[PDB]
Amino acid sequence: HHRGLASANVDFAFSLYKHLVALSPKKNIFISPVSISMALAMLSLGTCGHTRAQLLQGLGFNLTERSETEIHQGFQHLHQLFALEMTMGNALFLDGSLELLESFSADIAHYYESEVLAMNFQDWATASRQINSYVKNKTQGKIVDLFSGLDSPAILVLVNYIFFKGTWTQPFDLASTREENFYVDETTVVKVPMMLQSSTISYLHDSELPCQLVQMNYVGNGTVFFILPDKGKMNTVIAALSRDTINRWSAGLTSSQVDLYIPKVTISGVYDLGDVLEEMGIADLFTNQANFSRITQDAQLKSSKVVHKAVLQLNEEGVDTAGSTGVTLNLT
Amino acid sequence: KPIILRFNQPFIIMIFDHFTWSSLFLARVMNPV
Ligand SMILES: CC(=O)[C@H]1CC[C@H]2[C@@H]3CCC4=CC(=O)CC[C@]4(C)[C@H]3CC[C@]12C
């Protein structure tokens, strides 16, 4: 099954991004929304009551028009489709002192194909290093140090990872790459390796918004939008981001002769998404009132942390990207 | 006459799976290095 939760996940994606952007004036942002969605959807498998309803709604789902089951099947079909190169996976790291409910184990296996790995969380230093090692392998070395030792303890950790390697259908010219000015703002200018290609490219000078954009494919199914807002107009353009805007852009894009200069990009985001998720309505999950009563029988759990790490390497051949989302739970 | 497009100021990257329409990656590039 292909597109059933596209609308919800992409709404969540844009929303999260907009909230992340408003909480950071001058920094690079890079996130994998699908990883966050999958991580939180899996987590909801252990939730009940107000906790459950609030989380699924914050993830973009209308619970009066689609059941919890339908949502989880959608994430299952997503996972199957992903798992030149794309991989996506889920793991559950568990303390020996925690007996999971069978139906919960059944669900994470059925819908999310989660690995279940029994660790000892009494020594957070070793546990976190082990989990980190796991994420590093699964992302082929791209995501290191997802968890700190600085972090609180945990009794249970849920992890999603994503890795993606795309090859431009239209690579940039290696002989044309050179140092050029990158204007960070009016006053700040840096030197960056700037790629060039001269070719037929999908281009649109937007008449409704202060921006130009191009669209580019990867070999296979991947595609990418590069959007250049006018000087100082970044937040205007960001506010307009929506499925509808992408649809309007997609209708406006025309094959054109373009001298296309795009810098080599190497950026990486590290987020504690707690605050942002609360701004998005997802709140009870982080409190003592959290209902995690589908996970185990006789322990009261809450979420302490939702962490996200993503890395982007962009060059003349394509894109090397990875992402990973961790949720720690401990006894309230 | 070719359109000259220079991404030498803050810009947005959006990566999608054309098949499922998933938002795979979202970037705000303020400083690419
Ligand atoms: C035809 C095409 O290039 C595809 C690639 C990515 C696709 C979009 C991905 C996001 C998306 C999610 C939706 O639920 C509505 C349609 C849209 C807005 C898609 C419209 C068609 C697009 C633009």
mmCIF file of C-alpha atoms and ligand atoms in Angstrom:
data_model
loop_
_atom_site.group_PDB
_atom_site.id
_atom_site.type_symbol
_atom_site.label_atom_id
_atom_site.label_comp_id
_atom_site.label_asym_id
_atom_site.label_seq_id
_atom_site.Cartn_x
_atom_site.Cartn_y
_atom_site.Cartn_z
ATOM 1 C CA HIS A 1 0.000 0.000 0.000
ATOM 2 C CA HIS A 2 1.431 3.325 -1.214
ATOM 3 C CA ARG A 3 -0.077 6.735 -0.313
ATOM 4 C CA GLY A 4 -2.648 6.238 2.507
ATOM 5 C CA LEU A 5 -0.916 8.350 5.137
ATOM 6 C CA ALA A 6 0.956 10.741 2.880
ATOM 7 C CA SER A 7 -1.397 13.615 3.643
ATOM 8 C CA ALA A 8 -1.118 13.169 7.415
ATOM 9 C CA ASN A 9 2.649 12.564 7.483
ATOM 10 C CA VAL A 10 3.460 15.443 5.170
ATOM 11 C CA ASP A 11 1.216 17.770 7.218
ATOM 12 C CA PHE A 12 3.102 16.627 10.295
ATOM 13 C CA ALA A 13 6.396 17.090 8.433
ATOM 14 C CA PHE A 14 5.657 20.692 7.427
ATOM 15 C CA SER A 15 4.197 21.525 10.839
ATOM 16 C CA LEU A 16 7.162 20.153 12.750
ATOM 17 C CA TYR A 17 9.559 21.935 10.419
ATOM 18 C CA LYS A 18 7.734 25.260 10.828
ATOM 19 C CA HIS A 19 7.807 24.892 14.609
ATOM 20 C CA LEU A 20 11.492 23.900 14.532
ATOM 21 C CA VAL A 21 12.313 26.931 12.345
ATOM 22 C CA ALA A 22 10.463 29.379 14.655
ATOM 23 C CA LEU A 23 12.530 28.084 17.604
ATOM 24 C CA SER A 24 15.924 28.824 15.938
ATOM 25 C CA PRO A 25 16.644 32.086 14.072
ATOM 26 C CA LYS A 26 19.975 31.463 12.333
ATOM 27 C CA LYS A 27 20.822 27.763 12.381
ATOM 28 C CA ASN A 28 20.763 25.073 9.705
ATOM 29 C CA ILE A 29 17.848 22.727 10.117
ATOM 30 C CA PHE A 30 17.926 19.206 8.851
ATOM 31 C CA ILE A 31 15.381 16.538 9.813
ATOM 32 C CA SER A 32 13.871 13.272 8.601
ATOM 33 C CA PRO A 33 10.120 13.677 9.190
ATOM 34 C CA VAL A 34 9.236 10.106 8.141
ATOM 35 C CA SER A 35 11.577 8.802 10.850
ATOM 36 C CA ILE A 36 9.900 10.906 13.497
ATOM 37 C CA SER A 37 6.440 9.824 12.321
ATOM 38 C CA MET A 38 7.371 6.148 12.334
ATOM 39 C CA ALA A 39 9.015 6.408 15.762
ATOM 40 C CA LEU A 40 5.991 8.097 17.319
ATOM 41 C CA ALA A 41 3.498 5.814 15.582
ATOM 42 C CA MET A 42 5.282 2.810 17.035
ATOM 43 C CA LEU A 43 5.316 4.449 20.468
ATOM 44 C CA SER A 44 1.525 4.930 20.295
ATOM 45 C CA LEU A 45 1.200 1.149 20.177
ATOM 46 C CA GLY A 46 1.876 1.218 23.932
ATOM 47 C CA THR A 47 -0.443 4.125 24.659
ATOM 48 C CA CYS A 48 -4.053 4.414 25.845
ATOM 49 C CA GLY A 49 -6.633 7.060 26.680
ATOM 50 C CA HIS A 50 -5.957 10.765 26.323
ATOM 51 C CA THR A 51 -2.232 9.958 25.764
ATOM 52 C CA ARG A 52 -3.044 7.820 22.683
ATOM 53 C CA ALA A 53 -5.671 10.103 21.077
ATOM 54 C CA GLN A 54 -3.511 13.187 21.575
ATOM 55 C CA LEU A 55 -0.410 11.557 20.040
ATOM 56 C CA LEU A 56 -2.192 10.140 16.965
ATOM 57 C CA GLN A 57 -3.910 13.535 16.366
ATOM 58 C CA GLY A 58 -0.596 15.383 16.787
ATOM 59 C CA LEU A 59 0.843 13.013 14.155
ATOM 60 C CA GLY A 60 -1.781 14.398 11.727
ATOM 61 C CA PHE A 61 -4.404 11.667 11.915
ATOM 62 C CA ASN A 62 -8.139 12.211 12.077
ATOM 63 C CA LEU A 63 -9.339 9.435 14.368
ATOM 64 C CA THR A 64 -13.001 9.842 13.319
ATOM 65 C CA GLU A 65 -12.154 8.806 9.725
ATOM 66 C CA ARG A 66 -9.395 6.196 10.195
ATOM 67 C CA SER A 67 -8.832 3.630 12.951
ATOM 68 C CA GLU A 68 -5.622 3.053 14.881
ATOM 69 C CA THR A 69 -5.312 -0.281 13.039
ATOM 70 C CA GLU A 70 -5.454 1.425 9.595
ATOM 71 C CA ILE A 71 -2.706 3.851 10.635
ATOM 72 C CA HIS A 72 -0.416 1.051 11.812
ATOM 73 C CA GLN A 73 -1.027 -0.985 8.649
ATOM 74 C CA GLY A 74 -0.102 2.132 6.680
ATOM 75 C CA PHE A 75 3.159 2.465 8.543
ATOM 76 C CA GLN A 76 3.710 -1.256 7.969
ATOM 77 C CA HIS A 77 3.265 -0.834 4.229
ATOM 78 C CA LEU A 78 5.590 2.151 4.270
ATOM 79 C CA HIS A 79 8.241 0.132 6.089
ATOM 80 C CA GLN A 80 7.968 -2.805 3.660
ATOM 81 C CA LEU A 81 8.365 -0.483 0.666
ATOM 82 C CA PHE A 82 11.540 1.118 2.043
ATOM 83 C CA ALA A 83 13.182 -1.888 3.748
ATOM 84 C CA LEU A 84 20.250 3.341 -5.581
ATOM 85 C CA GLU A 85 19.788 2.696 -1.830
ATOM 86 C CA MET A 86 17.200 3.232 0.905
ATOM 87 C CA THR A 87 16.798 1.594 4.288
ATOM 88 C CA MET A 88 14.516 2.128 7.262
ATOM 89 C CA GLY A 89 14.194 0.146 10.488
ATOM 90 C CA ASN A 90 12.912 0.060 14.056
ATOM 91 C CA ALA A 91 14.435 -1.246 17.274
ATOM 92 C CA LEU A 92 13.309 -1.581 20.906
ATOM 93 C CA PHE A 93 15.986 -1.686 23.615
ATOM 94 C CA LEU A 94 14.659 -3.145 26.807
ATOM 95 C CA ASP A 95 15.804 -3.471 30.411
ATOM 96 C CA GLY A 96 15.860 -7.014 31.838
ATOM 97 C CA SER A 97 13.539 -5.802 34.633
ATOM 98 C CA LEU A 98 10.719 -5.056 32.166
ATOM 99 C CA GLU A 99 8.296 -7.704 30.940
ATOM 100 C CA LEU A 100 6.484 -6.424 27.831
ATOM 101 C CA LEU A 101 2.847 -7.339 27.320
ATOM 102 C CA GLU A 102 2.520 -10.061 24.668
ATOM 103 C CA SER A 103 0.011 -8.111 22.540
ATOM 104 C CA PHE A 104 2.468 -5.167 22.510
ATOM 105 C CA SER A 105 5.324 -7.466 21.409
ATOM 106 C CA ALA A 106 2.935 -8.914 18.843
ATOM 107 C CA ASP A 107 2.063 -5.440 17.477
ATOM 108 C CA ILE A 108 5.599 -4.027 17.196
ATOM 109 C CA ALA A 109 6.625 -7.238 15.423
ATOM 110 C CA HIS A 110 3.592 -7.238 13.156
ATOM 111 C CA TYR A 111 3.398 -3.563 12.171
ATOM 112 C CA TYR A 112 6.928 -2.179 12.673
ATOM 113 C CA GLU A 113 9.122 -5.274 12.393
ATOM 114 C CA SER A 114 10.960 -4.009 15.442
ATOM 115 C CA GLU A 115 14.055 -5.742 16.756
ATOM 116 C CA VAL A 116 13.831 -6.411 20.507
ATOM 117 C CA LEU A 117 17.155 -6.189 22.263
ATOM 118 C CA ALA A 118 17.500 -6.829 25.968
ATOM 119 C CA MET A 119 19.989 -4.469 27.609
ATOM 120 C CA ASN A 120 21.020 -3.490 31.123
ATOM 121 C CA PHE A 121 20.137 0.167 31.700
ATOM 122 C CA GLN A 122 21.661 0.295 35.215
ATOM 123 C CA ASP A 123 24.884 1.369 33.468
ATOM 124 C CA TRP A 124 23.610 4.092 31.142
ATOM 125 C CA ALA A 125 27.168 4.750 29.915
ATOM 126 C CA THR A 126 27.379 1.230 28.387
ATOM 127 C CA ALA A 127 23.727 1.017 27.333
ATOM 128 C CA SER A 128 23.875 4.332 25.447
ATOM 129 C CA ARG A 129 27.166 3.320 23.812
ATOM 130 C CA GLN A 130 25.585 0.015 22.714
ATOM 131 C CA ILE A 131 22.473 1.723 21.274
ATOM 132 C CA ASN A 132 24.732 4.285 19.592
ATOM 133 C CA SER A 133 26.757 1.443 18.035
ATOM 134 C CA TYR A 134 23.552 -0.077 16.720
ATOM 135 C CA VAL A 135 22.378 3.176 15.062
ATOM 136 C CA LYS A 136 25.829 3.837 13.603
ATOM 137 C CA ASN A 137 25.869 0.429 11.883
ATOM 138 C CA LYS A 138 22.292 0.680 10.621
ATOM 139 C CA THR A 139 23.026 4.127 9.109
ATOM 140 C CA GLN A 140 26.340 2.925 7.654
ATOM 141 C CA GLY A 141 28.343 5.210 9.955
ATOM 142 C CA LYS A 142 26.345 8.366 9.258
ATOM 143 C CA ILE A 143 24.550 8.786 12.603
ATOM 144 C CA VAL A 144 26.952 8.570 15.543
ATOM 145 C CA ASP A 145 26.391 9.498 19.204
ATOM 146 C CA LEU A 146 22.568 9.669 18.933
ATOM 147 C CA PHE A 147 22.327 9.376 22.722
ATOM 148 C CA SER A 148 24.548 11.159 25.214
ATOM 149 C CA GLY A 149 25.722 9.835 28.567
ATOM 150 C CA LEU A 150 24.575 13.234 29.810
ATOM 151 C CA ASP A 151 20.988 12.039 29.220
ATOM 152 C CA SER A 152 18.741 10.847 32.063
ATOM 153 C CA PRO A 153 18.455 7.133 32.731
ATOM 154 C CA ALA A 154 16.009 4.936 30.800
ATOM 155 C CA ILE A 155 14.225 1.595 31.236
ATOM 156 C CA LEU A 156 13.164 1.299 27.597
ATOM 157 C CA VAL A 157 14.312 3.022 24.424
ATOM 158 C CA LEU A 158 12.603 3.039 21.078
ATOM 159 C CA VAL A 159 14.602 3.826 17.947
ATOM 160 C CA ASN A 160 13.873 4.435 14.281
ATOM 161 C CA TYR A 161 16.640 4.846 11.676
ATOM 162 C CA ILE A 162 16.610 5.878 8.027
ATOM 163 C CA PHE A 163 19.350 5.867 5.409
ATOM 164 C CA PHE A 164 19.155 7.191 1.849
ATOM 165 C CA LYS A 165 21.606 7.356 -1.041
ATOM 166 C CA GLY A 166 20.347 9.128 -4.162
ATOM 167 C CA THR A 167 22.063 9.551 -7.525
ATOM 168 C CA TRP A 168 21.141 12.627 -9.545
ATOM 169 C CA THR A 169 19.621 11.680 -12.891
ATOM 170 C CA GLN A 170 21.566 14.795 -13.932
ATOM 171 C CA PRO A 171 24.906 15.017 -12.167
ATOM 172 C CA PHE A 172 26.812 18.249 -11.693
ATOM 173 C CA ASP A 173 30.057 18.859 -13.616
ATOM 174 C CA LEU A 174 33.056 18.000 -11.418
ATOM 175 C CA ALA A 175 35.356 20.210 -13.513
ATOM 176 C CA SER A 176 33.060 23.210 -12.962
ATOM 177 C CA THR A 177 33.047 23.112 -9.144
ATOM 178 C CA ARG A 178 34.750 26.064 -7.471
ATOM 179 C CA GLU A 179 34.853 28.437 -4.490
ATOM 180 C CA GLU A 180 32.099 31.083 -4.514
ATOM 181 C CA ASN A 181 30.536 33.540 -2.075
ATOM 182 C CA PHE A 182 27.669 32.327 0.062
ATOM 183 C CA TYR A 183 25.723 35.234 1.537
ATOM 184 C CA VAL A 184 24.497 33.998 4.926
ATOM 185 C CA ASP A 185 22.910 37.405 5.518
ATOM 186 C CA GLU A 186 23.438 41.096 4.624
ATOM 187 C CA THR A 187 26.665 41.209 6.670
ATOM 188 C CA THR A 188 27.923 37.584 6.741
ATOM 189 C CA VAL A 189 29.586 35.978 3.659
ATOM 190 C CA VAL A 190 31.347 32.600 3.473
ATOM 191 C CA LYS A 191 33.351 30.625 0.931
ATOM 192 C CA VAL A 192 31.712 27.386 -0.267
ATOM 193 C CA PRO A 193 32.322 24.752 -2.977
ATOM 194 C CA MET A 194 29.692 25.724 -5.557
ATOM 195 C CA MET A 195 28.518 23.133 -8.090
ATOM 196 C CA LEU A 196 27.405 23.942 -11.624
ATOM 197 C CA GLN A 197 25.420 22.283 -14.357
ATOM 198 C CA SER A 198 23.951 23.738 -17.582
ATOM 199 C CA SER A 199 21.023 21.609 -18.672
ATOM 200 C CA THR A 200 17.299 21.105 -19.003
ATOM 201 C CA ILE A 201 15.878 21.513 -15.518
ATOM 202 C CA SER A 202 12.370 21.839 -14.016
ATOM 203 C CA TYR A 203 12.198 25.482 -13.004
ATOM 204 C CA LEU A 204 9.646 27.921 -11.662
ATOM 205 C CA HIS A 205 9.895 31.574 -10.797
ATOM 206 C CA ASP A 206 6.910 31.690 -8.414
ATOM 207 C CA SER A 207 4.441 34.527 -9.078
ATOM 208 C CA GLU A 208 2.490 33.956 -5.817
ATOM 209 C CA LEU A 209 5.464 33.817 -3.412
ATOM 210 C CA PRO A 210 8.851 35.557 -3.294
ATOM 211 C CA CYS A 211 10.893 32.565 -4.524
ATOM 212 C CA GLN A 212 12.283 30.532 -7.384
ATOM 213 C CA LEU A 213 12.579 26.776 -7.317
ATOM 214 C CA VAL A 214 13.859 23.778 -9.189
ATOM 215 C CA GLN A 215 12.911 20.130 -8.986
ATOM 216 C CA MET A 216 15.379 17.272 -9.523
ATOM 217 C CA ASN A 217 15.121 13.514 -9.626
ATOM 218 C CA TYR A 218 17.275 10.726 -8.305
ATOM 219 C CA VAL A 219 17.659 7.475 -10.157
ATOM 220 C CA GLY A 220 14.668 5.460 -8.928
ATOM 221 C CA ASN A 221 11.808 7.145 -7.049
ATOM 222 C CA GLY A 222 13.476 9.955 -5.069
ATOM 223 C CA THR A 223 12.885 13.581 -6.012
ATOM 224 C CA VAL A 224 14.011 16.883 -4.519
ATOM 225 C CA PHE A 225 12.812 20.474 -4.439
ATOM 226 C CA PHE A 226 15.383 23.233 -4.031
ATOM 227 C CA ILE A 227 13.646 26.516 -3.127
ATOM 228 C CA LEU A 228 15.479 29.850 -3.177
ATOM 229 C CA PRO A 229 13.510 32.518 -1.334
ATOM 230 C CA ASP A 230 14.330 36.122 -2.194
ATOM 231 C CA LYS A 231 16.701 38.068 0.053
ATOM 232 C CA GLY A 232 15.229 38.054 3.590
ATOM 233 C CA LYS A 233 12.031 36.219 2.596
ATOM 234 C CA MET A 234 12.802 32.774 4.034
ATOM 235 C CA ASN A 235 10.112 32.846 6.745
ATOM 236 C CA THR A 236 7.449 34.059 4.265
ATOM 237 C CA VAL A 237 8.125 31.089 1.997
ATOM 238 C CA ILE A 238 8.307 28.679 4.936
ATOM 239 C CA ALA A 239 4.891 29.809 6.219
ATOM 240 C CA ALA A 240 3.364 28.901 2.846
ATOM 241 C CA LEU A 241 4.811 25.369 2.788
ATOM 242 C CA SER A 242 1.940 22.875 2.466
ATOM 243 C CA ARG A 243 0.782 20.003 0.261
ATOM 244 C CA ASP A 244 -1.287 22.563 -1.646
ATOM 245 C CA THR A 245 1.726 24.781 -2.346
ATOM 246 C CA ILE A 246 3.703 21.749 -3.542
ATOM 247 C CA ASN A 247 0.809 20.889 -5.838
ATOM 248 C CA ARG A 248 0.755 24.435 -7.250
ATOM 249 C CA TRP A 249 4.538 24.377 -7.691
ATOM 250 C CA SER A 250 4.316 20.975 -9.366
ATOM 251 C CA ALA A 251 1.787 22.387 -11.873
ATOM 252 C CA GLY A 252 3.927 25.510 -12.524
ATOM 253 C CA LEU A 253 7.354 23.823 -13.053
ATOM 254 C CA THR A 254 8.595 23.984 -16.666
ATOM 255 C CA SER A 255 11.579 22.359 -18.368
ATOM 256 C CA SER A 256 14.002 25.234 -18.964
ATOM 257 C CA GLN A 257 17.633 25.970 -19.843
ATOM 258 C CA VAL A 258 19.184 26.838 -16.500
ATOM 259 C CA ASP A 259 22.732 27.528 -15.380
ATOM 260 C CA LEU A 260 22.284 25.840 -12.027
ATOM 261 C CA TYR A 261 24.657 26.733 -9.207
ATOM 262 C CA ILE A 262 24.108 24.793 -5.990
ATOM 263 C CA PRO A 263 26.679 24.574 -3.197
ATOM 264 C CA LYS A 264 28.046 21.324 -1.855
ATOM 265 C CA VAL A 265 26.162 20.903 1.430
ATOM 266 C CA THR A 266 27.269 19.031 4.515
ATOM 267 C CA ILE A 267 24.971 19.734 7.445
ATOM 268 C CA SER A 268 23.601 17.827 10.430
ATOM 269 C CA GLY A 269 20.836 18.484 12.937
ATOM 270 C CA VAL A 270 20.674 17.268 16.540
ATOM 271 C CA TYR A 271 17.324 17.935 18.264
ATOM 272 C CA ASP A 272 15.559 17.390 21.556
ATOM 273 C CA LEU A 273 12.044 17.474 20.165
ATOM 274 C CA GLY A 274 10.215 17.513 23.527
ATOM 275 C CA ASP A 275 9.412 21.236 23.532
ATOM 276 C CA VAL A 276 8.377 21.315 19.856
ATOM 277 C CA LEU A 277 6.140 18.218 20.173
ATOM 278 C CA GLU A 278 4.373 19.907 23.088
ATOM 279 C CA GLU A 279 3.797 23.010 20.929
ATOM 280 C CA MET A 280 2.219 20.630 18.424
ATOM 281 C CA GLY A 281 -0.198 19.334 21.086
ATOM 282 C CA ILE A 282 1.728 16.170 22.056
ATOM 283 C CA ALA A 283 2.030 16.783 25.812
ATOM 284 C CA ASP A 284 0.649 14.048 28.148
ATOM 285 C CA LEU A 285 3.283 11.640 26.886
ATOM 286 C CA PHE A 286 5.986 13.607 28.759
ATOM 287 C CA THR A 287 4.064 13.880 32.069
ATOM 288 C CA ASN A 288 3.286 11.597 35.004
ATOM 289 C CA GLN A 289 -0.228 11.387 33.586
ATOM 290 C CA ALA A 290 1.085 9.478 30.559
ATOM 291 C CA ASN A 291 -0.897 6.355 29.774
ATOM 292 C CA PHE A 292 1.574 3.668 28.628
ATOM 293 C CA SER A 293 -0.545 0.852 29.947
ATOM 294 C CA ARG A 294 -0.314 -1.215 26.756
ATOM 295 C CA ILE A 295 3.472 -1.714 27.245
ATOM 296 C CA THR A 296 3.620 -3.599 30.596
ATOM 297 C CA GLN A 297 1.123 -4.623 33.262
ATOM 298 C CA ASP A 298 2.323 -3.014 36.505
ATOM 299 C CA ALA A 299 4.802 -0.232 35.771
ATOM 300 C CA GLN A 300 3.998 3.441 35.247
ATOM 301 C CA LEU A 301 5.995 4.823 32.342
ATOM 302 C CA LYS A 302 6.533 8.240 30.805
ATOM 303 C CA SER A 303 8.666 9.586 28.000
ATOM 304 C CA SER A 304 11.722 11.575 29.069
ATOM 305 C CA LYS A 305 13.165 12.354 25.687
ATOM 306 C CA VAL A 306 12.545 12.323 21.984
ATOM 307 C CA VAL A 307 15.832 12.858 20.173
ATOM 308 C CA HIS A 308 16.430 13.263 16.482
ATOM 309 C CA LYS A 309 19.629 13.285 14.494
ATOM 310 C CA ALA A 310 19.897 13.755 10.707
ATOM 311 C CA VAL A 311 22.863 14.247 8.358
ATOM 312 C CA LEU A 312 23.024 15.435 4.767
ATOM 313 C CA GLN A 313 25.965 15.081 2.419
ATOM 314 C CA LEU A 314 25.239 16.735 -0.949
ATOM 315 C CA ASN A 315 27.685 16.601 -3.884
ATOM 316 C CA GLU A 316 28.040 16.332 -7.683
ATOM 317 C CA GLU A 317 26.893 12.665 -7.808
ATOM 318 C CA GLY A 318 23.958 12.964 -5.438
ATOM 319 C CA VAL A 319 22.911 12.797 -1.838
ATOM 320 C CA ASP A 320 24.031 10.705 1.123
ATOM 321 C CA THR A 321 21.568 11.150 4.027
ATOM 322 C CA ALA A 322 20.609 9.473 7.254
ATOM 323 C CA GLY A 323 18.249 10.076 10.157
ATOM 324 C CA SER A 324 17.386 8.523 13.488
ATOM 325 C CA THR A 325 14.778 9.162 16.169
ATOM 326 C CA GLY A 326 15.070 7.918 19.754
ATOM 327 C CA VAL A 327 12.440 7.892 22.485
ATOM 328 C CA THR A 328 13.495 7.116 26.039
ATOM 329 C CA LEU A 329 10.970 5.955 28.610
ATOM 330 C CA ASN A 330 11.477 5.615 32.363
ATOM 331 C CA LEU A 331 9.486 4.876 35.484
ATOM 332 C CA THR A 332 7.544 7.998 36.575
ATOM 333 C CA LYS B 1 19.217 32.616 -23.174
ATOM 334 C CA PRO B 2 19.680 30.286 -20.149
ATOM 335 C CA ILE B 3 18.242 31.218 -16.754
ATOM 336 C CA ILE B 4 21.033 31.816 -14.235
ATOM 337 C CA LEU B 5 20.072 30.408 -10.824
ATOM 338 C CA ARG B 6 22.573 30.759 -7.964
ATOM 339 C CA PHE B 7 21.832 29.107 -4.616
ATOM 340 C CA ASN B 8 24.239 31.503 -2.851
ATOM 341 C CA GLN B 9 21.782 32.578 -0.126
ATOM 342 C CA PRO B 10 19.676 30.711 2.460
ATOM 343 C CA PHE B 11 17.514 28.022 0.819
ATOM 344 C CA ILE B 12 15.182 25.068 1.441
ATOM 345 C CA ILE B 13 15.678 21.415 0.472
ATOM 346 C CA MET B 14 12.730 18.993 0.427
ATOM 347 C CA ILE B 15 13.300 15.327 -0.356
ATOM 348 C CA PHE B 16 10.310 13.173 -1.287
ATOM 349 C CA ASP B 17 9.629 9.607 -2.303
ATOM 350 C CA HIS B 18 7.625 10.033 -5.535
ATOM 351 C CA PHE B 19 6.134 6.566 -4.924
ATOM 352 C CA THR B 20 4.621 7.003 -1.434
ATOM 353 C CA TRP B 21 4.890 10.820 -1.328
ATOM 354 C CA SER B 22 6.773 10.541 1.992
ATOM 355 C CA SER B 23 8.646 13.530 3.287
ATOM 356 C CA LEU B 24 12.061 11.860 3.649
ATOM 357 C CA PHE B 25 14.129 14.938 4.532
ATOM 358 C CA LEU B 26 13.562 18.632 5.141
ATOM 359 C CA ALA B 27 16.319 21.227 5.272
ATOM 360 C CA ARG B 28 16.731 24.875 6.012
ATOM 361 C CA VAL B 29 20.217 25.624 4.704
ATOM 362 C CA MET B 30 21.399 28.869 6.299
ATOM 363 C CA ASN B 31 25.085 27.965 5.956
ATOM 364 C CA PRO B 32 26.103 24.981 3.807
ATOM 365 C CA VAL B 33 29.607 24.594 5.234
HETATM 366 C C1 LIG C 1 4.406 14.605 -9.510
HETATM 367 C C2 LIG C 1 5.540 14.768 -8.528
HETATM 368 O O1 LIG C 1 6.611 15.260 -8.870
HETATM 369 C C3 LIG C 1 5.352 14.296 -7.097
HETATM 370 C C4 LIG C 1 6.664 14.087 -6.313
HETATM 371 C C5 LIG C 1 6.387 14.466 -4.853
HETATM 372 C C6 LIG C 1 4.870 14.642 -4.857
HETATM 373 C C7 LIG C 1 4.157 15.334 -3.689
HETATM 374 C C8 LIG C 1 4.612 14.754 -2.352
HETATM 375 C C9 LIG C 1 3.817 15.331 -1.183
HETATM 376 C C10 LIG C 1 2.330 15.212 -1.452
HETATM 377 C C11 LIG C 1 1.572 14.618 -0.515
HETATM 378 C C12 LIG C 1 0.100 14.568 -0.620
HETATM 379 O O2 LIG C 1 -0.535 13.928 0.203
HETATM 380 C C13 LIG C 1 -0.604 15.307 -1.737
HETATM 381 C C14 LIG C 1 0.290 15.319 -2.978
HETATM 382 C C15 LIG C 1 1.752 15.750 -2.752
HETATM 383 C C16 LIG C 1 1.797 17.278 -2.654
HETATM 384 C C17 LIG C 1 2.627 15.204 -3.907
HETATM 385 C C18 LIG C 1 2.199 15.724 -5.296
HETATM 386 C C19 LIG C 1 3.006 15.132 -6.460
HETATM 387 C C20 LIG C 1 4.514 15.223 -6.225
HETATM 388 C C21 LIG C 1 4.969 16.685 -6.390
#
